[PDB]
Write a protein that binds this DNA or RNA. Structure first.
Ligand SMILES: NC(=O)CC[C@H](N)C(=O)O
Ligand SMILES: [Mg+2]
Ligand SMILES: [Mg+2]
Ligand SMILES: [Mg+2]
Ligand SMILES: [Mg+2]
Ligand SMILES: [Mg+2]
Ligand code: NA
Ligand code: NA
Ligand code: NA
Ligand code: NA
Ligand code: NA
Length: 94
RNA sequence: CGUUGACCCAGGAAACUGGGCGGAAGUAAGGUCCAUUGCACUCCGGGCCUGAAGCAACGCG
């Protein structure tokens, strides 16, 4: 049941798991910095966290625009599925 | 691993202390086979193969 409550952070899944962590992070940044200031991008290839990423924007409006505009975009041959993060990210609790 | 140092962070009036920061390690990472659509921020699934680096220098291994 898709998370639709707006947030500073977007949650992305259905990411291609064969992409190297570093290259994935850099591609995500390239794709999303257009939408606004990104504080951070959290990427892990653990069993639990692979295929997934969190990109943290400074403004909520940036996250919203990023979410709406990049939905379903084919990224390393896989359509990105984007929702808002369920709860705030740490840096945003600061 | 040692020495003499550089830079960043926390604390300290300071001296400096603690990290970042070296043989680290069969680790991080990479290839493949299997498994996985998973809401995290304190790494981190399994097999086989491969496999690094402190910031500088010199010494040692
Ligand atoms: N990793 C290391 O311990 C490097 C040592 C090497 N002798 C050097 O001068 O850099
Ligand atoms: Mg001070
Ligand atoms: Mg010191
Ligand atoms: Mg030293
Ligand atoms: Mg050296
Ligand atoms: Mg020797
Ligand atoms: Na200080
Ligand atoms: Na004091
Ligand atoms: Na240090
Ligand atoms: Na691999
Ligand atoms: Na493997």
């Amino acid at each position: 049941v898709p998370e639709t409550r707006p947030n500073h952070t977007i949650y992305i899944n259905n990411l291609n798991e064969k992409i190297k962590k570093d290259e994935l992070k850099k591609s995500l940044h390239a794709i999303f910095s257009r939408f606004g200031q990104i504080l951070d991008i959290l990427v892990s290839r653990s069993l639990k966290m692979r295929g997934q990423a969190f990109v943290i924007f400074k403004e909520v409006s940036s996250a919203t625009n990023a979410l709406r505009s990049m939905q379903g975009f084919p990224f390393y041959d896989k359509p990105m599925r984007i929702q808002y993060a369920k709860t705030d990210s740490d840096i945003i609790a600061k």
